[PDB]
Write a protein that binds this DNA or RNA. Structure first.
Ligand SMILES: [Mg+2]
Ligand SMILES: [Zn+2]
Lengths: 52, 163, 190, 198
RNA sequence: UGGCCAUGGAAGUCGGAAUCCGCUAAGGAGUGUGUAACAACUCACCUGCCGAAUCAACUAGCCCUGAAAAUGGAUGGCGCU
């Protein structure tokens, strides 16, 4: 239904992300802290939930 | 056997365990069962006849189907033959205390076990196979008044007769 | 603490002519001129060697927040030399599930019309940055090429048409649609 | 750890240098664990297989230790991915065995091509699935009674040509692996004399 | 080594007493993705490339998050870096 390398290239911008637990911010997948002042750099991070 | 059913030289051997007790469902109902002229009742009877007395414990059964019958061969596993040489009987019915008596001390049977090893483990002479088989078991692991840590490393016997 | 000196040198090749009016550097060569005003950055920019072979950047008595700027000045100088000599070419592919995204340039590459994104009727017009040329390449189905000299302008122009094609009020993990940057290279390789 | 292991590694390399005076410098490239176990089961009795590392520059100490000169040829040539094969019997027979010890080693996308790759007329062995991945490259594939059949021998990958991702995936689906050599020998050390592996 | 209780399923895999050898350069009877079970993707160690200061845990300062009230509001005000 879609080309797989272009699907992975869309995954790199839409799904391969880190999400903070405090402010729910979308972060780069190599992150150990958060950017936002509003969460105080909480560093409680999770991977973004992959689609089934 | 690709198009619908053409047995030309069917000698398919696959890996299969749990052939000592017939169990409840026997794990034979899926696709391996009805494909290959293997019935369930005669197959369970022959599997029980191969997993008959001496020994009644769960072993590995490799099966050969010559279009009408199943020949089950038991490959000699070290833990399975140690648990078979463990003192019988303990299956159920005053079980639960538990499986780990361990009063065998593997006296003169590991020589024949090393003779019946099927050239596996990428081995040198039997001085390494002794240290493999002295640590692979998990019941008593050594003689009754010894420890398997720093005693198996010094063995001055059994270097020639094992091959 | 205050570190007494942080220095870094940039060896420019012979195809590049650079000069500086204070902290205002100008880099000219084959593809054109590029200026950058490093006022309010507060470093020392010396330019040494016969025919100005290297650009040396100094920071004197700066703590960590201003020691972190010597390498970014060096990186902007590398990117400007790369844009003058080899240029910047950003390739970006149109990923769609069902509706084919129709992209058409209008003047040369300045105004870009995006149509049929998620079956919408609203056309998406994007003005590019001055100096960025947009094109539809050959031997590839749905793919845009952004050519230019300034990496800032080319990548900002890529980010504009990447953020123009976003999916609203849906699951974007399922709706993987839009024009996404796939390759970042130069115009010529040399 | 990290001291006794290094001392044991030094004792092992000096024991192999005192045991086998002839060594082969081969490639330790892309290989599997079962593949290395098959290589060891082939060279079980005679040869000894060893990994080279940065502490293989103790041949200078071996030459300093009052025994053997002319060991400085082996010192710059520890480059790449290095394996040592210590043996005693013969050079050209064990070289022919290492040549015949090639591995199928299903290919990867991005490697170089040693020879030309052809596709014989053989079906995929599957049902009526999609033929777009085979027809996008220019391969004559038809559907004759379920199986996808190739109707013309087409030379896809030439010598020195880069392997594409789609053609690599269709070669992995067709289960054809020509992009393997196994181990590549570089230098043959023979009791002080250095020969050319030709 | 489908090692071992778990049969309702553990060939690393819901879990727990166990918890080492061989090839050895190297895989802990295993960190996850995930299964009626599998299979498969994938982390200790090192080599090919850059060649000198780096890593980890605590702890004390200032600042930030935590920190939301109703008339417009107060380091006293202006303001101050
Ligand atoms: Mg919704
Ligand atoms: Zn946050």
């Amino acid at each position: 239904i879609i080309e797989p390398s272009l699907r992975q290239l869309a995954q790199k911008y839409n799904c391969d992300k880190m999400i903070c637990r405090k402010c729910y911010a979308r972060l780069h997948p190599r992150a150990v802290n958060c950017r936002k002042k509003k969460c105080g750099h909480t560093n409680n991070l999770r991977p973004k939930k992959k689609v089934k | 056997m690709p198009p619908k059913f053409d047995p030309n030289e069917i000698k398919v051997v696959y890996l299969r365990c749990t052939g000592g007790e017939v169990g409840a469902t026997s794990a034979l109902a899926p696709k391996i069962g009805p494909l290959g002229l293997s019935p369930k009742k005669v197959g369970d009877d022959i599997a029980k006849a191969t997993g008959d007395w001496k020994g009644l414990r769960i072993t590995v059964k490799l099966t050969i189907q010559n279009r009408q019958a199943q020949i089950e061969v038991v490959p000699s596993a070290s833990a399975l033959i140690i648990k078979a040489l463990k003192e019988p009987p303990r299956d159920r019915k005053k079980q639960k205390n538990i499986k780990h008596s361990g009063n065998i001390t593997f006296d003169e049977i590991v020589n024949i076990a090393r003779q019946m090893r099927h050239r596996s483990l990428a081995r040198e002479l039997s001085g390494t196979i002794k240290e493999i088989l002295g640590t692979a078991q998990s019941v008593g692991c050594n003689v009754d008044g010894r420890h398997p840590h720093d005693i198996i490393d010094d063995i001055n016997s059994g270097a020639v007769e094992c091959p | 603490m205050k570190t007494i000196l942080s220095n870094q040198t940039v060896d420019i090749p012979e195809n590049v002519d650079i000069s500086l009016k204070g902290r205002t550097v100008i880099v000219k060569g084959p593809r054109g001129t590029l200026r950058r005003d490093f006022n309010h950055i507060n470093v020392e920019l010396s330019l040494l060697g016969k025919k100005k072979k290297r650009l040396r950047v100094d920071k004197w008595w700066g703590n960590r927040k201003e020691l972190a700027t010597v390498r970014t000045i060096c990186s902007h100088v590398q990117n400007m030399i790369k844009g003058v000599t080899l240029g910047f070419r950003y390739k970006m592919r149109s990923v769609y599930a069902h509706f084919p995204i129709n992209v058409v340039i209008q003047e040369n590459g300045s105004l870009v019309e995006i149509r049929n994104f998620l079956g919408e009727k609203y056309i998406r017009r994007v003005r590019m940055r001055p100096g960025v040329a947009c094109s539809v390449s050959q031997a590839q189905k749905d793919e845009l090429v952004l050519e230019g000299n300034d990496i800032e302008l080319v990548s900002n122009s890529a980010a504009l048409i990447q953020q123009a094609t976003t999916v609203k009020n849906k699951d974007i993990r399922k709706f993987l649609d839009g024009i996404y940057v796939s390759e970042k290279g130069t115009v010529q390789q040399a | 750890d990290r001291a006794t292991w290094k001392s044991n590694y030094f004792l092992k390399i000096i024991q192999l240098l005192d045991d086998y005076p002839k060594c082969f410098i081969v490639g330790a490239d892309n290989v599997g664990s079962k593949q290395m176990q098959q290589i060891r089961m082939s060279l079980r009795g005679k040869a000894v297989v060893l990994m080279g590392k940065n502490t293989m520059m103790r041949k200078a100490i071996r030459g300093h230790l009052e025994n053997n000169p002319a060991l400085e040829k082996l010192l710059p040539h520890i480059r790449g991915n290095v394996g040592f094969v210590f043996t005693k019997e013969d050079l050209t027979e064990i070289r022919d065995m290492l040549l015949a010890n090639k591995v199928p080693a299903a290919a990867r996308a991005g490697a170089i091509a040693p020879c030309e790759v052809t596709v014989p007329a053989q079906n995929t062995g599957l049902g009526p699935e999609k033929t777009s991945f085979f027809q996008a490259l220019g391969i004559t594939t038809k559907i004759s009674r379920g199986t996808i059949e190739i109707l013309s021998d087409v030379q896809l990958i030439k010598t020195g040509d880069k392997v594409g991702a789609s053609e690599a995936t269709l070669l992995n689906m067709l289960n054809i692996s020509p992009f393997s050599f196994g181990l590549i020998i570089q230098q043959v050390f023979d009791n002080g004399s250095i020969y050319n592996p030709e």
